[PDB]
Every structure is written in structure tokens, then in C-alpha cells.
């Protein structure tokens with residue numbers, strides 16, 4: 145069940161707008177930057193960032209898509225089920241986008257998929273929520289909210305494009 | 318000698334816009350917030366931030382001013398003048414300075430605010446953190462972290478007074 | 490109600506040993522360093538750190554004491570007593586407390602040290618940082634970062650006074 | 662040429678001892694931990710950490726070895742040339758050790774090599790020096806010293822086992 149709401153629609157809006165500004169700042173413009181969303185919600189978040197960056201800079205940013213699913217037996221392995229990145233990645237700054245960073249293993253799989261699409265100049269990572277508990281030496285460059293969790297809690301990201309509401313909450317039990 | 322330009326006008330512009338977003342985000346809106354600039358360049362930065370926040374949020378943020386000078390004979394920063402024409406009690410007071418170095422100026426500014434009234438919180442925004450703290454002070458909002466040696470100096474130039482927006486490192 | 494144990498005796502032991510190493514490393518030896526404990530449990534932690542540093546380095550570190558109490562009617566921490574039987578001028582003074590929360594107690598302690606003399610630097614070591622700062626203060630050395638809500642409370646128990654070394658979160 | 666010394670023998674000693682304490686603290690003991698050194702100097706550093714951890718805890722930590730070299734054409738790719746990890750990695754905390762973290766691409770290669778030796782519970786990263794300039798979302802768990810550098814500077818790590826001295830310095834020109 146739902147334990148607590150940790151980001152409402154306004155907190156998500158402000159966090160996404162701030163991240164768009166951070167991306168442009170960090171890269172000193174969006175020249176050579178592309179966004180790649182991870183799974184359904186990462187893809188909606190990537191689209192939202194691209195629209196915001198376009199409104200700020202007046203140049204559009206390509207958005208690509210990775211579908212990653214978990215295979216089991218526990219321990220699990222995230223594998224790429226589908227790829228739609230209809231633009232070059234070689235010599236670009238590829239910004240991966242996901243809803244939640246947890247152990248880091250999904251991002252490792254995504255980073256590895258981009259690295260074998262081509263030869264990016266760099267790979268960055270934007271997430272709406274970092275819930276801690278990394279199991280790999282991976283970190284986000286851009287983070288909406290740091291949300292401390294126990295190992296038994298779940299973060300649930302709801303976005304209006306699929307869930308009818310923008311909300312992030314902690315679930316348990 | 319000027320050794321490097323570390324922020325140009327566009328870098329400063331982007332940093333101030335980003336800090337404005339951070340201030341609004343962290344405080345969940347700007348209700349109850351006020352800015353207090355430290356010294357000439359801190360005041361100009363505080364005025365810039367107030368304008369950005371108004372441009373983003375559609376609400377104005379009061380700006381106050383502290384004039385702080387160094388006394389010697391180890392130095393001690395003292396308040397030479399205060400112009401804060403609004404209440405500080407129950408507000409979030411955001412101090413603004415151009416560079417954070419030892420933290421001694423901010424300690425003086427924080428102590429000055431705490432003697433004006435009873436703020437809910439004091440926050441600190443600086444354009445540049447150059448390291449070398451001598452007190453347990455940190456900025457809440459930072460334009461750029463700029464590593465320096467103790468022999469180096471940060472120079473912040475702002476168009477209102479210097480005719481250019483630029484941050485540079487100097488030595489010798 | 491006690492909601493969780495967040496550090497047991499072995500976690501506290503390991504954290505204090507690690508902080509002792511950090512203090513020595515950051516200051517490139519303990520020449521010129523002194524510890525000043527805040528309140529009962531801060532003083533016990535400062536004594537533990539002094540001993541660890543001596544066990545590691547083979548040199549003793551002076552320990553001083555500040556007694557700070559809350560006055561009300563918003564609270565204000567005030568110094569009720571000081572026992573710092575060594576010079577602070579030109580030294581690195583390392584304040585020690587059990588928990589960092591708003592930072593208001595540390596601001597009082599830092600202001601007290603700065604009125605004893607002219608330290609080279611003031612540093613801060615705490616067993617627990619529970620977040621929720623209301624001032625631009627940060628610890629230099631931290632045993633554990635323990636996220637809390639505003640309704641929660643950290644309780645630090647130390648064997649000298651409580652018969653157990655344990656940190657816990659409480660609520661209600 | 663040598664621009665500046667940034668860590669002398671004493672700074673390296675203290676940093677390594679402090680990291681050994683951090684490793685034990687972070688993992689709540691060294692139960693289930695193994696060290697894997699990267700290249701010649703990472704391997705000496707891994708051996709030093711293992712000796713320190715043994716002196717502190719009174720239990721030995723296995724040390725494995727990866728030899729990674731750069732292939733070119735620039736852009737480069739680090740590849741594994743040799744592996745000597747004579748113990749299981751499955752369900753262990755694998756702590757990678759290297760002398761310098763720069764773009765992160767060597768660690769990505771090492772992380773990927775461990776992940777295909779088996780199924781570690783987690784991978785951590787200890788480095789003597791983080792010189793910045795990441796090109797991947799990778800970060801060290803344990804760091805000797807953060808040493809700011811320009812893109813034109815080099816960090817040079819000298820260790821007594823091969824170089825006759827323990828010293829870290831910045832080189833240029």
C-alpha cells in the first residue's frame with residue numbers, strides 16, 4: 145500500500161524544469177546532446193526534458209528510447225528488449241533518463257547498450273528519484289529528489305501520460 | 318596576473334537562472350523568502366536573483382544589503398552598515414555573496430541577521446565556492462565550485478560595476 | 490516510540506575510529522589541534538576521539554567542554570558554562586556534538602570559541618547528521634547521515650551515561 | 662614535466678589506512694568482501710588495502726588482478742588482457758581498486774569483466790586519486806584524494822613496489 149507521497153505534481157514540475165537548466169549549464173549549451181529514455185516512464189520524462197530544453201534554448205534535442213526488462217534465476221539481469229534511437233550517438237553527449245535510480249543495474253545495462261550503438265563523447269544520467277542502495281559504482285548527474293528508503297520500501301512514479309496523475313510515493317507491506 | 322577565465326557572461330547567466338530555480342524549488346515557492354546581499358557585488362547578485370525569481374514565479378522578493386569590512390591586528394569582518402527595510406522574523410533569509418572562501422564574512426553576516434530578528438532559517442547562495450573553509454559553513458546554492466590554491470585569488474566582475482560579467486583566477 | 494536502531498556499538502566504534510583517521514589526515518597530523526565537546530554526550534564523544542587519536546598517533550589532544558542550554562519565548566541556545574583550559578588562538582578547534590539538526594547549537598558553540606580567542610580554524614565532528622539545517626552550517630566529519638522527518642527524533646546513547654552505545658530514531 | 666607534488670609518502674599512507682577503515686565500516690565487516698586490483702599500480706594498492714584490513718580485523722581479504730590495456734582508432738577502448746581472480750565473485754562484495762579515476766572508462770571495462778565472471782552481490786570502487794572529468798555516470802565509493810586537474814594535465818602515481826618512491830604529482834607540457 146501507499147505509505148507517503150514524496151513528490152506532488154508541482155514538485156515534479158519544478159524538479160524537471162530545474163534539471164533542464166542543469167543539463168544546459170553542465171554541457172555549456174545543448175549542442176551535441178541527445179536524450180535516451182529508459183522504459184515507458186523514462187521515455188515520458190525524456191520527452192518532458194526535451195520540450196523544456198527547447199523552450200529554454202530554442203533548439204530541439206533528439207529523444208531515443210530503450211526498453212529494458214528483467215530476466216530472473218533472487219538475482220536478476222536487466223536486458224535490452226528493444227531500441228529506438230534514430231540518430232547518431234557517436235561523438236555526442238548521451239543523457240540517459242530514468243524514473244528511479246536504485247541498485248544501478250538497469251543503468252549499467254543502458255550504458256552498455258549505448259556504448260555498443262557507437263562511440264559517444266560522454267554518457268550522463270538524469271533521474272527523477274534517487275532512492276539509494278547502489279550495488280554498482282554508478283551515480284546520477286542530475287537528480288529530481290533524493291528519497292531515502294528502506295530495502296523493503298518501493299518508489300512508485302506516476303506520470304500523467306499513463307497513470308493519470310503526476311505523483312511519486314513510497315509503498316510498502 | 319590573471320591566470321584563467323572560469324566563468325563567462327553566459328556561464329554566470331546560466332548559473333544565476335539555475336540558482337533561482339533551486340531557491341524556489343527548495344523553499345516550495347518563494348512565500349516568506351527574502352534576499353540579503355553582502356557588499357557591493359553580493360548586492361548586485363542578490364538583485365539579479367530577485368529579478369530572476371520574479372521573472373520565473375511572478376512574485377517579487379525583497380532585497381536587503383549588508384556592508385562588511387575587514388578590521389586588522391588574522392582579520393575580523395565587521396558590519397559597517399545595514400539596509401534591510403523589511404522584517405526577518407519568521408522568514409527564510411537567503412544571504413548572497415560573490416565568493417565563499419574561509420566563511421568568515423558569512424559568519425559575520427549570519428550573526429548580523431540573527432541580531433536583527435528571529436528568522437525561520439538562513440540560507441546562503443554564492444556565485445563561486447573557492448574552498449579553504451576555516452569554519453563549518455557551507456553554501457546552499459553555488460554558481461560554480463572553483464578549486465584554488467592558497468596563493469590564488471578569485472576576481473568576480475559584474476557589469477553594473479566592472480563593465481563585464483566574468484569570473485577569473487589570479488596569482489602572484 | 491523507538492522506531493529503529495540505526496547504529497549499534499560496533500557501528501559507533503567503527504565511525505569514531507574512522508573520524509579520528511579523518512581528523513589526522515585532514516590536518517596533516519594533530520599538531521595544533523584541540524577538541525571541544527558540546528554538552529554531556531558531545532564531551533564524551535570528544536574524549537573518545539582524543540583517545541583514538543592518541544592511540545593512532547601517539548600524541549595527546551587537549552579536550553575542552555561547553556555547556557549549552559535552550560532558552561525559550563523559537564529557542565535560542567546559550568552558553569551556561571565553559572571549561573577550555575588551553576589556548577584556542579592559532580589552533581584548529583574541532584567542535585564535537587552528538588547530533589547536527591538545525592545547526593543552531595553549533596552556531597552558538599562556534600560564536601563562543603570565536604570569543605575565547607583567535608583560532609586558525611573551527612571544524613565540526615558529529616556522530617549523526619539528521620538533516621533539516623536552518624543555517625548554513627555543515628559538519629566536517631560525520632559518523633552517519635540519518636535521514637529523518639521533522640516528527641522524528643534521534644536518541645544517542647553512550648555507555649558512560651546510558652549503559653549502552655546505540656543510536657535510534659524515535660517518534661510520536 | 663612535473664608541475665607539483667600533490668601527495669607525499671605520508672599522505673598516501675594515511676589515505677590508504679583511512680580507506681581500509683571506510684571499507685570495513687561501509688560493509689559492516691569484511692565478511693564476503695574481495696579486492697580486485699586494476700593494472701600494476703591498482704594491484705599494489707589492492708595488496709596494501711588487504712594487508713591493512715587484515716591488521717585491523719584479523720581476517721584476510723582475497724586479492725584478484727585485472728590487466729587492462731587501451732586499444733585505439735582519438736577515442737580509445739580499454740580491454741581486458743588478462744585476469745587472475747582465483748576465488749568466487751558470485752554473492753560477494755567486489756571492491757575494484759585503481760590508482761586514478763579520470764573518465765571512468767577503465768572502471769566501466771573492469772565492472773563489466775567482474776559482471777561476467779559471475780554474479781557479485783555488489784561492486785564498489787576505491788581509488789587513490791579522483792582527478793575529475795568523468796565521461797560516464799561512474800563514481801568512486803572510496804577516494805584517497807580529490808585532485809582537480811585541467812584536461813591537459815596528467816596525474817602520475819609512483820609507488821615504492823615499482824617506482825622506488827610513494828608520490829603523486831601533476832605533470833604537464
Ligand SMILES: O=c1ccn([C@@H]2O[C@H](COP(=O)(O)O)[C@@H](O)[C@H]2O)c(=O)[nH]1
Pocket residue numbers: 182183242243244245246247248249250251275297298299300301
Ligand atoms: O523503487 C524502485 C526501484 C526500481 N525501479 C525501476 O527499476 C529500475 C531501477 O532499478 P535499479 O536497476 O537501479 O535497481 C528503473 O528503471 C525503475 O523504473 C522502480 O521503479 N522503483
Ligand SMILES: O=c1ccn([C@@H]2O[C@H](COP(=O)(O)O)[C@@H](O)[C@H]2O)c(=O)[nH]1
Pocket residue numbers: 355356414415416417418419420421422423447469470471472473
Ligand atoms: O578569492 C577571494 C576571496 C575572498 N573574496 C571576498 O571576501 C569574502 C569571502 O571571504 P571569506 O570571508 O569567505 O574568507 C567575500 O565577501 C568576497 O567578496 C574574494 O572576492 N575573492
Ligand SMILES: O=c1ccn([C@@H]2O[C@H](COP(=O)(O)O)[C@@H](O)[C@H]2O)c(=O)[nH]1
Pocket residue numbers: 527528586587588589590591592593594595619641642643644645
Ligand atoms: O534529534 C535530535 C535533535 C537535536 N538534538 C540535540 O540538540 C543539538 C542539535 O540540535 P540543533 O541545534 O542542530 O538543532 C545537539 O546538541 C543534540 O544533542 C538531539 O539529540 N536529537
Ligand SMILES: O=c1ccn([C@@H]2O[C@H](COP(=O)(O)O)[C@@H](O)[C@H]2O)c(=O)[nH]1
Pocket residue numbers: 699700759760761762763764765766767768792814815816817818
Ligand atoms: O591522469 C591519469 C589518467 C588516467 N590514468 C590511468 O588510466 C586509468 C583511468 O583512466 P579513465 O579510464 O578513468 O579515463 C587508470 O587505470 C589510470 O592508471 C592515469 O594514470 N593518470
